[PDB]
Write a protein that binds this ligand. Structure first.
Ligand SMILES: *C(=O)[C@H](C[C@@H]1CCNC1=O)NC(=O)[C@H](CC(C)C)NC(=O)[C@@H](NC(=O)C(F)(F)F)C(C)(C)C
Ligand SMILES: *C(=O)[C@H](C[C@@H]1CCNC1=O)NC(=O)[C@H](CC(C)C)NC(=O)[C@@H](NC(=O)C(F)(F)F)C(C)(C)C
Lengths: 302, 302
């Protein structure tokens, strides 16, 4: 019993994180096969069409790349792909895991390996927000940190960190070099669209709250609405109230079955609680938790 | 910028987690040098003075110990230390880190390496609560999972998982075999004292919020009380209102000096917001976060 936001174990990723520095700019890279992926602003703070000329003038021998075992790696080629710099090394990483480069969708949760100087210093879970940001924890030096999970023995790489926006919002690229949310790696004002609370994850959390209450009180929570709202009617309301649309999933179907509570009561609960939460907390809170996924809640049922 | 509840990276610990089974009981062990530490109920569900006779009846050849890579280990001796079974292996773990066994005090926070079948499947942070429990996420098979952190290249082990109490509360031993909270490894009703909100960690979270509001709005937070309360006055109030006592620490002093905000203004804020929070959130919430430590907040400013 108990529900937590889980982080993936980090050993396979630690074996791929390296330090990449260039003329005083210190970042991190992801070393897979004979290729290092790292943010292109290791070269400096350029914009637009300046990047290809910067790339052509750069020199491989000035990339200072070190492994966590203190081996120096040697760059033999360089290219840009989107906002990611791709550096080829003279020898391959013999500890390359099975992996895939996947784009995270809104509401998908994954683990950040927060790295400084080529060393992972801590991990934490994040959710890709509707507007292409994550709420993370990064300082100067953390760029190149990656977001990942592990599924069926494969490391999925979702994210490489580039940029901190106002209000402690973070963004970056996938491992293809494409920025989430259409941001850019420039120190200029950038529009950030409103964050929409992730309905499917809130639904998971309400089900976790019901399981908690039932497993140790056999009595449905007082805050749970008995009235229902249809999905299309909730989704109409969601578009006007800053929530993502509800969409069915295998995990949500199972959680509704396991608890015996109609998801349409949970949606009506979202609508009521959002308008006026009142004095009844849900798992101790008076605000919605939307970074715990239905799959994670399911996996924590025994 | 941004604040998260961080998890330690797990590679050093993954190299020490093994599976330990005995006559159908399947749990995990921690393999350091030539010694495996695991919960003594791998031998079965006994009580009181029975454990010594059970230990004497056990036979080393019937322990099934396997490493994550599938290597079978051979037990050559056995002894009890509190509720921990200590098994000696014929060969030492060549991947043993530098480590310490430390007992966590109330408010101390650390990482759970959640393991099934000898394999770490996920990590998450926890805080040692005032009643000697942690609020974790465990299923059958998880016993022997360990709580740890890493400081200055040394793995501190704080916790080994044994038992789930009512209301999804978890507890277990330190690596010396002593149960937290005076619980026992028996499937009986046990006395669980109140879980008091952890003042020192709430103070950390309020400094985090102060830091965030300074960075976002160039002002003190609207919710921050201007009056101070003395520590002695606060601590009398805490004992009547389900809070732990405040106590100074190096990290809290550093946060007070960095922000320029007297910690006694934070203590007054706790008293006021606990009695009537109102509609102003703190870092998005209307309830106290008490599992982010002063040390972690300090580390996330640099
Ligand atoms: C990695 O090099 C850092 C990580 C940042 C530093 C503070 N927290 C982080 O996550 N990235 C940068 O310093 C980045 C460099 C660009 C050239 C891509 N700059 C920023 O993130 C800046 N942000 C912006 O200017 C903004 F997004 F437009 F707001 C700051 C001001 C340095 C945070
Ligand atoms: C590891 O072997 C499990 C971990 C448990 C399983 C469910 N979630 C957990 O964290 N521990 C046990 O099964 C343990 C064995 C004892 C002999 C130490 N038993 C329990 O945790 C039981 N708890 C109790 O009887 C209680 F604490 F008194 F409440 C349950 C009922 C199996 C959870």
């Amino acid at each position: 019993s108990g529900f937590k936001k889980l982080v993936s174990p980090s050993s396979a990723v630690e074996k791929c994180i390296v330090s990449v520095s260039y003329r005083g700019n210190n970042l991190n890279g992801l070393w897979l096969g004979d290729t290092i992926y790292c943010p292109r602003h290791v070269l400096g703070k350029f914009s637009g069409d300046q990047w290809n000329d910067v790339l052509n003038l750069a020199n491989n021998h000035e990339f200072e790349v070190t492994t966590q075992h203190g081996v120096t790696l040697n760059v033999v080629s360089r290219r840009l792909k989107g906002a990611v710099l791709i550096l080829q090394t003279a020898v391959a990483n013999a500890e390359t895991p099975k992996y895939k480069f996947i784009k995270a969708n809104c509401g998908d949760s994954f683990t950040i390996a927060c790295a400084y100087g080529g060393t992972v210093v801590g991990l934490y879970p994040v959710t890709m927000r509707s507007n292409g940001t994550i709420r993370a924890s990064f300082l100067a030096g953390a760029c190149g940190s990656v977001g990942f999970n592990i599924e069926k023995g494969v490391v999925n790489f979702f994210y490489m960190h580039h940029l901190e926006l106002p209000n402690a919002l973070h963004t970056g690229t996938d491992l293809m070099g494409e920025f989430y949310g259409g941001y850019v790696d420039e120190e200029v004002a950038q529009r950030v669209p409103p964050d929409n609370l992730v309905t499917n994850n809130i639904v998971a959390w309400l089900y976790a709250a019901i399981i908690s209450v039932k497993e140790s009180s056999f009595s449905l929570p007082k805050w749970l609405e008995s009235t229902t709202v249809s999905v299309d009617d909730y989704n109409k309301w969601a578009g006007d109230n800053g929530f993502t649309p509800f969409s069915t999933s295998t995990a949500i179907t199972k959680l509704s079955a396991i608890t015996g509570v109609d998801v349409c009561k949970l949606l009506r609960t979202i609508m009521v609680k959002n308008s006026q939460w009142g004095g009844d907390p849900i798992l101790g809170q008076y605000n919605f938790e939307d970074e715990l996924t239905p799959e994670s809640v399911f996996n924590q049922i025994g």
